[PDB]
Amino acid sequence: GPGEALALTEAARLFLRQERDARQRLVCPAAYGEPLQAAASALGAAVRLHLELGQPAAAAALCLELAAALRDLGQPAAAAGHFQRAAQLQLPQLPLAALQALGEAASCQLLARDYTGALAVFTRMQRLAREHGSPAALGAFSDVLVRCEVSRVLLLLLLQPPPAKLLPEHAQTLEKYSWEAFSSGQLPEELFLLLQSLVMATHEKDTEAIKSLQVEMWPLLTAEQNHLLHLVLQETISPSGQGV
Amino acid sequence: IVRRGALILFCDYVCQNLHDSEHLTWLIVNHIQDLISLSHEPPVQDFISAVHRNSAASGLFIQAIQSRCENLSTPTMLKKTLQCLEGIHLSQSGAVLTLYVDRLLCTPFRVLARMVDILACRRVEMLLAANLQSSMAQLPMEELNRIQEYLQSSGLAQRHQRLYSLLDRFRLSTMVSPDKDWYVHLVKSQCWTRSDSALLEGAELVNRIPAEDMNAFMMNSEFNLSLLAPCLSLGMSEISGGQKSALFEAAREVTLARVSGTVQQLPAVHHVFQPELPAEPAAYWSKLNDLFGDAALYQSLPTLARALAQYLVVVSKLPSHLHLPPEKEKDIVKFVVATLEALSWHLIHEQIPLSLDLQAGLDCCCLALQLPGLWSVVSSTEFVTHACSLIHCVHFILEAVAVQPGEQLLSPQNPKYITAACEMVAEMVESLQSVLALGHKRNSGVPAFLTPLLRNIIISLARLPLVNSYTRVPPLVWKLGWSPKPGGDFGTAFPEIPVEFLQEKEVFKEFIYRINTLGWTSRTQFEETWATLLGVLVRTQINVLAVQAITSLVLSAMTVPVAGNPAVSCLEQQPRNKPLKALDTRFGRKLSIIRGIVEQEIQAMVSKRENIATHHLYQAWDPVPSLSGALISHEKLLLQINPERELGSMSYKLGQVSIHSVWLGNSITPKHRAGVDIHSCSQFLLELYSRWILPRTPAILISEVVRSLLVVSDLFTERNQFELMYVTLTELRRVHPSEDEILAQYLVPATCKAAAVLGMDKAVAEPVSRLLESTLRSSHLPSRVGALHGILYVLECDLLDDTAKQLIPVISDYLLSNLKGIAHCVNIHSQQHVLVMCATAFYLIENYPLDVGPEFSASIIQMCGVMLSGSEESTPSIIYHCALRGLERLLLSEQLSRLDAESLVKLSVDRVNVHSPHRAMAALGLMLTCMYTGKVIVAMERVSVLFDRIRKGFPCEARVVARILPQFLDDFFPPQDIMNKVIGEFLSNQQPYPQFMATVVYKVFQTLHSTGQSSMVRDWVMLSLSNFTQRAPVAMATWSLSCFFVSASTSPWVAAILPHVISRMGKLEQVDVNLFCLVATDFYRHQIEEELDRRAFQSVLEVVAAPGSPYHRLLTCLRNV
Amino acid sequence: GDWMGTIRTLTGNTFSLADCIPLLRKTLKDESSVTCKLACTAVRNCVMSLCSSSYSELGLQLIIDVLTLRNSSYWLVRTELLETLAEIDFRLVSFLEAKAENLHRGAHHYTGLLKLQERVLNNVVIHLLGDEDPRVRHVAAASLIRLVPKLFYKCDQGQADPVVAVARDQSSVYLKLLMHETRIYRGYNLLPSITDVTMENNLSRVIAAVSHELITSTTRALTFGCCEALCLLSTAFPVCIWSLGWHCCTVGMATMILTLLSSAWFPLDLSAHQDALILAGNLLAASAPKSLRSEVWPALGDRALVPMVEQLFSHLLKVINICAHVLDDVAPGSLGSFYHLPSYLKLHDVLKATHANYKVTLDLQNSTEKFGGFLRSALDVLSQILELATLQDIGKCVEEILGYLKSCFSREPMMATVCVQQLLKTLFGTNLASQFDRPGLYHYCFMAPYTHFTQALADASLHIRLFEPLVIKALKQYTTTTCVQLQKQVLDLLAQLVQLRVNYCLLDSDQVFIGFVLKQFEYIEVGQFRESEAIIPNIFFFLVLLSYERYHSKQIIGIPKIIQLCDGIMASGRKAVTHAIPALQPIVHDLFVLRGKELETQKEVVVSMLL
């Protein structure tokens, strides 16, 4: 029963150790990686056993193990897939665990440079945090909300979706960073003011202001969000799609 | 707490004792900043409100803010200051406006500039509403003029135009020819600035300046150096196309000249940069505080480094005379070092430098350490201090970005800077596993645009002779009792680790990591590590490790560029599919262009950039040598690379080398590597393996040796080597019975590869079908995947059995049975299995369309059609792009009967309508191939879906569709059927990107003048009765009219100013009106001609009279003609 | 400044207090772990005083310096570091960080911020929850509990900036309002429970971090430590009171912990197993006044919880059965049956080993004993869960539960008695589920305390046959034991039996028990009862209850005799606080509130002794 699940997960863990050794620990530019497939098969069997026993949380934990291993080995997209698998397995009993898994999936999508996928996961996270986080979120959900908000603003400034294809969620967020009258939300005042200035500077095509804001916002953002802001500045100065 | 609470209490006391004003005056004048900081507190709120109800108190408030705005510059402090100034008493509407415009308007924080705009706008509205005798009193005569003069001298009247208009209202109440030199002056009006606003457009502009005076234009002290990297980039696109670019050559001379110029300002003797405190060593540091210490020069080093990196990233693919000369190389090296030092200097004095400047410096370092001319310089002994400064600055930047105070980078003669650099390079090399592993638990402090740069720089620096010998030693060996005496023309050459210090598994693992990460810098080092690994081999699990290290080391020789440099090189690939014959024709040569564009964009969007270090987008290249060898350009391998490896993935796959390349390069009718005798290693491993697996060898080592053989056979050169391989593997099949567990995975594909290389016959290579069929029926997939890889090896060019053809249905039924299940579910299944299955199926359909026919090659199209249409979650992106590219090769290859071919051309319409832009771009490529291969209203549907992609796509996808549209239009059907649509798409309101459609219209109009349609263009232009001049954004109306008349012009120098017009899509300044009048007049005189048409033109303007300026000034110009 | 100036005038030496901080820093980087632990102790002694001083930058530097000690290959350094970091006020550290500008760079000119609170909370305290030494894990959990109240988070609606948080901490002590003013189990709270929103946010973030480390735990030790920490938090911040901080009530973390309990290695670690049982019971109890109805477990209504409650109930019965087999030494071979389950058979092996080791030792003051602690915790959670049971759930189960208690009573008689009391509550239907039917620095410093003060000043002008052998065993153990907590619990059980209207002649036919209880008063008054302070209130409650009772309608004890016992305790002996006052409380309550003419003179006597 559960002892077979234990045997399987502890086999998969050693398999993942061996793949990490053969690939990263001792770099081998001659291996495509066999123990990763063995670990994937073992983890899948363990997940299915746990789902049969009525334990979606243990199966989601195994999916998280596999996803972290996949992201380690330089496979961000498959990692994001498995992270979202775990988040769905956890969702209607552990919203916070699912929000953590979805944040991992969004980080993995940003690693894979899948910016629309990361934007979609960030919006799903903000939605779920608003539904389960209670204006005045609980505080464990307020962290998720702050991260998803900053990341969504940065990703919408990077992508710049056209007004035609622009969801009501995206527009409702973007209009919040336009200013007309004396509001920060779950965001600290300084960061929120810098984000409003960033939105208004990328809209009015002010490169010098964007550079000043890039330097000012560096300590306030995570390195993931510093990457997003660097991409915004670079897409402003050197747009993608021109071929030169 | 006491300070703030006591101020709050005193404010609440003054709120109530308001009759006396000395405490109020004292509070204001002495604690204005505390009042503003605490303004959210109700007593302070009430105090500020009471200040607002007192003209003298409000004046004291403003006088105190004017003397304290220094610290009210912080975004929060300034927002609070504005919240306080908002309700200021009306009797001070002249003072607070003065403060607004003099101090608070020009803030780098744009939201506060907007707040100030609104509040000042209201202050003038109030001055206007209040009567005259007071409005003139608060705002004096010359004060209003000085406010307007500050707004106009600065560019502030243009960002805040409503404020300028309100001030104008208040004062009112209170009392050329389009020739070469005009174009040159107009360009100079935009490129002799210092602005990063329109770099691409400015590059397209300076490109048209004549070649005879282009190098003298980019070399003045006014030319924006921010343009050099675009000008190179654009210039590259005209050398990549095949022509000669004067833009690229001029920008290159200017870039190298400016690099030499700024290097000249460096001190003569160079000292190592050390961040501790560079003041003690010499007065050198005074000069380097004056050099890149100001901004006039520091703000030119990364701007020059961006240009230098743009140049250095393409010198690997340039004509020979466009490589950098040997005289500049030292220059360049010094520049690179200096740039990094500048960055490190900025880090020490003024916080993070700039995401762009950092990237530019690290790009220059990365790229310079990859060029041989520059490596050989910085690797020498005269440049030891420069290499030491490189190591010091890289370590410094990595710690300043990634290590918090209180943490360490790694978390569990002989000047001291030599030892420091050795230990720092070793530490950074160990950091490549955790801190600089993209997607590792410890890469979260690094922003991921520095991680590939830092990995590549660190490998390159760890290969320097100054630190290489030290770095190759594991630290677990320093923990033991090993310390010899080094000396190597530097003082740091260490003897390699003795094998007694390698018998432990941990030290050996660390040493293997070192040698695999760093590679080998020469044949000598390769031979040293070869002898070391052999002497380790000659114990529990050390043999597996040694065999894997040996095969890694020999695969290191396969990398086509810089023999064994991981930073520069990747494993050479020889794809099994061949160059398609549908191209190299008339319509195939146009599909080549239109699809190469989409391919560049798909590469920029989905490719894992494993062989690419810097950020530069259009850097894709494949490790495929000509073999007829230089590397084959990426645009000649359009649909050639093996369909089962991910886009941009460069690791080792079963199938790296095609059997055709075996039979061709080393002619084996069915010497050594780059500088290293790989034939001797080939024979040595062949003998040692053919004498190790047949005679108590444990299975866990049999598997590893067969794996190593399967890998190394990519290096075999002669037929007898493959013969020995096959005989050994057959005798091993006989010796080792059905018990494999892990042997079939490598036994079956090694057997099949060797059998295929030997011109497969029914003589000895007959019984491969038996174990092939036996292997497709297994319990674990790895063996079946190796079986499919062997199937591909054997299907390449080897007539199966030379008699019996049962193998093709044996394969095809496995394919058709195992693929059909994986279409409603692809994530739960293995990616590698699906990819090799589709690769097999596509190779069968293309090279064996005789045995396949009813069930295969038609249901496979169904597998792919149901995979391509799966949800973005259900179908991963690597499987999507594999299936799409395989379908595109099946389509472009004519090996299909025309009921699955057509069943494919109709598979493309559903896939452009997806949200994910990279899947959309892949679908667009598939659609373009369906169009160009199978070649009226269907083409109209296609052009309409193209315009819809422009209309509802992200700016990248839209820009790409707009770049490919003109060719597509003038390729598939005549201009009269589209010159309506395209114009309607440039003249619309739902169009999010008129600036792309402007270039589309321009290209269509200028391509009209091909066969003699230089008159249809003025006819379609005169069709501006209703469409044009009816555009509620009058600014957008005159902009689109100017763009349309630029596009519709037969005169040079006026058709060349379109990027100057597209650069200002709004911006209805007066120079824009003058440009519109000049351009419309140049269309009036030269084009119209018919005197009655002149009047049909003139009486289309005054319908929208607009006597202000957009059309009245034009009507005046036409009257002057 | 002034103190050092005075002392430098008097003595003459130019010693600066800013010269032992460099020595502490150097001593922390020492080669020896003994010296390292001693320097950590010195930092613990001085760091919070330094941060509150004009040398606060040096205190922040010392906090930065001690962080590297979490890697020590010596447990006592790690525990000293944990105890040092638990003393730090992170509202003050946040204030100092917000003021610092060149200290965020530290050495090597770091770009970015110190983020000391996040580093201390996640890289040290929660990281050392994964330590392989159980002692370090326990210290880390204790330090987490101490840290929760003083961890300033930004954009909190209670404290906008850290200055306001510090001001709150100061004002809550000295400006504490000078005012004043049917037995549910420890886990339930049928009240609004108005909690502090700032502490709610802190507890929410801490629980989220610990639950994340528990869900993604790839290590046995990390799982054990996170479970112990979450159990500690549910003790110090009860899920019933702090319902918002525990997510929600709690459907998810309860099923997560229950999955842990259905693992294959986790229940074999006795300490982590009992921590998990306590946590799961607490979480399932915190859902009472939102998930109760006024089928199986019919009083629940919220049916997402019924499977969790059923699973926990059956598991508790199985492990109490295992403990009963280990105590009544019987090898394994109808609801707590475990003979046909391998995981519970392995648990039986473990508990049998622990108890066989216990059977051959004589350490009666050993409190941390594993088998006794496990049985105590399991009985505790059974008693907590029984509050939600109605008779339908338990009426066909009570027989085997009582059989188990009869054998586990010899080992843990206090908790066996508690569980018998809960079973009597559920039988007679007296348990729960049967008886169920902007502000900153001016608000906190002056306005809210003054408003409370003036408002107070202005308002200042207005199936029983199955319980017989366990009850008999409890009474005999009372007559023979010296454990005061067991005697307190037996008196609670007897009081409950009397209030349930169970006849006293049924239990005390010879009046032997009250004979012994009154004979105890001799030693209580003489001062020869070792801990009588614990037993006296319960004795007097029981006697007051027995005064209402009728021995064949002839008074059993009587209020006058109780009053004489009380005044004999009072006028003869020592402190009235521990002895006389707690004896007068039951009499005062059950005489003035709950109560023709001799009652008046009894009240007169009580008022006289109160005076």
From Swiss-Prot, chain A:
Superkingdom: Eukaryota
Cellular-component GO terms for this entry: early endosome; nuclear body; nucleus
Subcellular locations according to the entry: Cytoplasm; Nucleus; Early endosome; Nucleus, Nuclear body
A GO biological-process term: negative regulation of proteasomal protein catabolic process
Keyword tags: Acetylation, Cytoplasm, Endosome, Nucleus
Tissue: Produced abundantly in a wide variety of cell types.
Listed transmembrane segments: none
Keyword Nucleus: yes
Entry function: RAB5A effector molecule that is involved in vesicular trafficking of early endosomes. Mediates the recruitment of HTT by RAB5A onto early endosomes. The HTT-F8A1/F8A2/F8A3-RAB5A complex stimulates early endosomal interaction with actin filaments and inhibits interaction with microtubules, leading to the reduction of endosome motility.
Subunit annotation: Interacts with HTT (via C-terminus). Interacts with RAB5A. Found in a complex with F8A1/F8A2/F8A3, HTT and RAB5A; mediates the recruitment of HTT by RAB5A onto early endosomes.
Record's disease association: Up-regulated in brain tissue from patients affected by Huntington's disease (at protein level). In a Huntington's disease mouse model overexpression of F8A1/F8A2/F8A3 impairs proteasome activity leading to the accumulation of mutant HTT and causes defective mitochondrial functions.
Protein name in the entry: 40-kDa huntingtin-associated protein
Native species: Homo sapiens (Human)
Stretch of the intact protein here: 83 to 371 of 371
From Swiss-Prot, chain C:
Signal peptide per UniProt: none
Reported effect, T368M: Found in a patient with Rett syndrome-like phenotype; uncertain significance
HEAT repeat start and end residues: 15-52, 115-153
Tissue: Expressed in the brain cortex (at protein level). Widely expressed with the highest level of expression in the brain (nerve fibers, varicosities, and nerve endings). In the brain, the regions where it can be mainly found are the cerebellar cortex, the neocortex, the striatum, and the hippocampal formation.
Subunit and interaction comment: Interacts with PFN1. Interacts through its N-terminus with PRPF40A. Interacts with PQBP1. Interacts with SETD2. Interacts with SH3GLB1. Interacts with SYVN. Interacts with TPR; the interaction is inhibited by forms of Huntingtin with expanded polyglutamine stretch. Interacts with ZDHHC13 (via ANK repeats). Interacts with ZDHHC17 (via ANK repeats). Interacts with F8A1/F8A2/F8A3. Found in a complex with F8A1/F8A2/F8A3, HTT and RAB5A; mediates the recruitment of HTT by RAB5A.
Family recorded in the similarity comment: Belongs to the huntingtin family.
Disease linked to the protein: Huntington disease: A neurodegenerative disorder characterized by involuntary movements (chorea), general motor impairment, psychiatric disorders and dementia. Onset of the disease occurs usually in the third or fourth decade of life. Onset and clinical course depend on the degree of poly-Gln repeat expansion, longer expansions resulting in earlier onset and more severe clinical manifestations. Neuropathology of Huntington disease displays a distinctive pattern with loss of neurons, especially in the caudate and putamen.
Record remark: domains: The N-terminal Gln-rich and Pro-rich domain has great conformational flexibility and is likely to exist in a fluctuating equilibrium of alpha-helical, random coil, and extended conformations.
Protein name: Huntingtin
Protein's organism: Homo sapiens
Lineage per the UniProt record: Eukaryota, Metazoa, Chordata, Craniata, Vertebrata
Whole-protein coverage range: 788 to 1576 of 3142
